[PDB]
Design a protein around this ligand. Structure first.
Ligand SMILES: Nc1nc2[nH]cnc2c(=O)[nH]1
Ligand SMILES: [Mg+2]
Ligand SMILES: [Mg+2]
Ligand SMILES: [Zn+2]
Ligand SMILES: [Zn+2]
Lengths: 577, 577
């Protein structure tokens, strides 16, 4: 294990992760600028100063140039580029996609990558073009897989194992499942460059989702060639963690200027809709008259700033549970991106497994699409049975109508549309009915039976809070989302009222003592867990004998908990000890 | 004539304008930072260095303070504030909002503003709150207008005549009519601060449109209190040319960070979604540790950069003919903004009057609301008749079905949605049918009768270009928009086929010679024009006797050509004499 990856925060199918490679730590989503070893528009040391702690170069281009190879073998790529962050390197597969044949063998560049002290390498995977004869897509993929097995045998460093299969979702699934069973640390998704250039974002969505579906969750995903800000928000919402960009430099040499919404020709710019170091002091009409070398430099820097800025924007949105809103905003950039956005939302089943149970932000109805967001479709179905049971429905701008008993609970209460939703507070005789409704809603069918005989306390306002029964607190309704926070007593009740494995996270014999003491539960110790658990659900920490050890909040889905070996699986609230 | 205002470019009902006062020019849309004479987070000279060439201060406050009072009379605000740009001042009406009455008379402040060398003054209009009872909306408006009448009498400086009818569109209309008929140079729209602070943007749209409907198009409109980047694109699209902001500073004082999509609390920021001098330099945490004063300063500056940046973004979009696409993107920032955006599109009649006829940018189907854009509804309606005659209905992504004869013309041809639309090139036999369908579509019913007996000469590609008869070239189908550019001969024919005033722009007797000569028609010399004329339409430059003087392209709407006293109204292609 030379590569460690763990989730720190999440939204949609996206996540902010901590990625460690042989001692170097980087936060994802992240973009690695592509550096041309022959003509570096922006010096690696300057990229590093700008905050780019990971970059990529062409080991093949280096290998072929006598001078470059000599220096790379003499000082290592790090000293050669005078860069200290993570240096990822490509294999020359891109030259393969352009010329068909390359003058170096898979084993050869791999060994070369090792010789120059590369942080992360890549083998000669074949980038089958889109809409290619299924025959070619298969023949090429098998070679890719063969070259992969070879790389798995000789690699001594972290390496990229790229998924191919052209535009055939079944080949994608196959590639993903196969490379997922091999010893590799990162899984790029290739062959998409031509799609991105053509703005065929819908096809990329299909390729990306089919790949993510078959890929094991705990490994970072890299979208090869997605180096333009316009796709960041969407790609990250699908679960992409890494991006690489050469366009920042190539566009600059073409007097092309990037924007989160697309690209513009410098000669069509009357104003700079940006405030970066470059745009804050210069002007379109000035830049246009500068020496090309200078014009290229300033554009490159600008492009890098906008790319860096989008990433930060995306991470900040994930942090506040607003990614979908941002994605919705960026979808209006281009008709094709809008097409791709609608398509992504059709994949409710894939998206639903990762969609957090509760978010910081309120549900915003800002378009027709938002009514199709994962959280909306989930709350709809989960409320159906709660309505035909508790009745007393009220009107809701977004969900139409929902029982007054869920009106204080996310996302019904925690949402906003064109018109405002009037939440109906409980009564002294009503309270418990709410707690029961929430339980049945948050924990599933039967959960109320753990609270029936309880007494709900009300705050200075008519809001439900502390839930008690013949003593100790069973749980508490949160003010922030109207969801229940389990106390050890309430956890015990749920445990006996709900059959195994509902709400369970089964831990290591070794992990048992810690959970009992209330320490947090770490993924590597989770041997099994309820497949229904969603990020942020209340959870029952248990041993194999299903004995309650503690209660806490999930940070991963049931499945992820099993698969993941790094990061916390559960944030424990209280233990049995 | 103490204020000149010219339209330099436009889109939607918005416009980029040239505003001159005291020989000081400024480009609009423009936002004026509100400056507090007592406390200044950022100082006028700094604001001037940042590029804010217009600001606003509270003359009443300056008045009520001995210190400022002396220095003001003594030095005159310009030197007092060490600012050399346009300085606008407010009456003290703001204090009226929160105090209901002040210790100064309409006449007193007005004369005081005159004494301190103010570039633009304001009288004591009463900012009636959003949903006041009708008797109050009415009472205060009459009081406002009496002060308007007094101000018009003694005025010796350009002044803001604020439209003030609360939330009664009929009162706004009246209020606008009256002030328009009076001698003032700028028209703010007031009583909206309470609405903006409550994100009640839909109500602001209704108030603005009802005001704009009754305002003289040639005068600048100012949305009083609209100082957050969130409403700019929307507001500009409604024809608002000026904004003032106090928020950039006040928000900073409460560690609130501005964004084109809204507002963020500093203690809730993990990353800065911006590249400005501040954000590209510091991190959220680095900011939180600084002393309150430094924090307030840096945040205030950041807010100013966001403001400045959105404006440049809005102006760039107008120049590109993509304002609506931006409004749409921005509509996704908040449910209340989305509600307002949809409402704005309900006001088709108002918007269509100012909406240009042809654009450089292609029509993008990026949302549901995209289908309700002015250009789309206009195209649908107009084409109905063409589809009824020339038939040959071909499929279209946005309009569904449309006669093939218009498939070469804007906005049908370039249009792009989830799937591209393929154009139908003419046959040497259908050629004429196209020129006729286009004419009927571009010039209105009957227009075709001016081209029936003509031959359409196709180019290197099966595209129609020059239209000739007997040897004289009537017009020529443009390659870019598929719209006809008239030739003096085509002009003549249309002149007799279409009943006055269709396509007519009537000029002075003094302008008659130039027009005949071929010179461009300036607005001030236009006495009357076809209400149906839209920006960029082909127009018939005629004299009062309806005698053809020349042909050209409109740069304003017919209604605008009449009221406007500055700028060109028609770019003449060719005179007659
Ligand atoms: N290895 C590799 N590099 C790429 N660069 C762009 N696309 C690809 C791809 O599919 N694979
Ligand atoms: Mg595990
Ligand atoms: Mg005129
Ligand atoms: Zn920039
Ligand atoms: Zn900033």
């Amino acid at each position: 294990k030379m590569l460690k990856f763990e989730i720190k925060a999440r939204d949609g199918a996206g996540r902010i992760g901590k990625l460690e490679v042989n001692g170097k730590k980087i936060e994802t989503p992240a973009i690695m600028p592509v550096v041309n070893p022959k003509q570096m528009v922006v010096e690696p040391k300057e990229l590093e100063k700008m905050g780019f702690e990971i970059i990529i170069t062409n080991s093949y281009i280096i290998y072929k140039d006598e001078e470059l190879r000599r220096k790379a073998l003499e000082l290592g790529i790090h000293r050669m580029l005078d860069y200290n962050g993570i240096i990822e390197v490509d294999s020359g597969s891109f030259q393969l996609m352009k010329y068909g044949s390359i003058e170096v063998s898979n084993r050869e560049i791999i060994e070369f990558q090792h010789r120059i002290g590369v942080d992360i390498g890549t083998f000669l995977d074949i980038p089958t073009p889109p809409d290619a004869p299924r025959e070619q897509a298969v023949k090429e993929l098998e070679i890719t897989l063969s070259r992969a097995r070879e790389a798995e045998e000789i690699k001594e460093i972290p390496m990229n194992a790229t998924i191919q299969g052209s535009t055939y979702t079944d080949l994608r699934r196959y590639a993903a499942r196969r490379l997922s069973s091999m010893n590799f640390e990162i899984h790029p998704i290739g062959g998409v460059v031509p799609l991105l250039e053509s703005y065929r974002f819908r096809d990329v969505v299909d390729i990306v989702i089919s790949s993510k579906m078959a890929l094991r969750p705990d490994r970072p995903v890299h979208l090869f060639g997605a180096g333009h800000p316009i796709v960041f928000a969407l790609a990250v919402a699908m679960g992409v963690d890494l991006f690489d960009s050469a366009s920042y430099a190539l566009y600059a040499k073409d007097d092309r200027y990037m924007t989160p919404e697309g690209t513009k020709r410098l000669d069509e710019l009357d104003y700079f809709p940006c405030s970066c170091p470059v745009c804050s002091k210069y002007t379109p009409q000035e830049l246009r008259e500068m020496p090309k070398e200078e014009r290229t430099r300033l554009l490159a820097l600008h492009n890098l700033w906008v790319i860096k800025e989008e990433i930060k924007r995306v991470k900040q949105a994930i942090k506040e549970g607003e990614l979908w809103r941002l994605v919705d905003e960026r979808a209006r950039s281009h008709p094709k991106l809008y097409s791709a956005y609608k398509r992504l939302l059709e994949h409710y089943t894939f998206l639903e497994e990762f969609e957090p149970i509760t978010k910081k932000s309120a549900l915003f109805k800002i378009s027709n699409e938002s009514l199709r967001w994962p959280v909306v479709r989930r709350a709809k179905e989960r409320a159906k049975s709660i309505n035909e049971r508790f009745g007393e429905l009220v009107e809701h701008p977004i969900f139409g109508r929902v029982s007054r008993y869920l009106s204080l609970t996310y996302p019904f209460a925690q949402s906003e549309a064109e018109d405002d939703f009037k939440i109906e507070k409980p009564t002294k005789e009503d309270a418990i009915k709410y707690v029961m409704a929430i339980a049945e809603y948050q924990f599933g069918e039967g959960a109320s039976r753990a609270f029936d005989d309880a007494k709900v306390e009300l705050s200075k306002t008519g809001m439900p809070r502390q839930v008690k029964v013949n003593g100790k607190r069973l749980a508490t309704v949160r003010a922030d989302d109207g969801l229940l926070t389990l106390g050890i007593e309430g956890a015990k009740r749920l445990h006996r009222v709900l059959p195994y494995p509902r709400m369970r996270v089964v831990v290591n014999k070794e992990a048992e003592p810690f959970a009992r003491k209330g320490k947090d539960v770490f993924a590597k110790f989770v041997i099994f867990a309820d497949p229904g658990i969603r990020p942020y659900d209340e959870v029952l920490v248990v041993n194999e004998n299903d004995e309650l050890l503690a209660t806490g909040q999930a940070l991963l889905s049931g499945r992820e908990m099993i698969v993941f070996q790094y990061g916390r699986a559960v944030k424990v609230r209280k233990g049995v000890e």
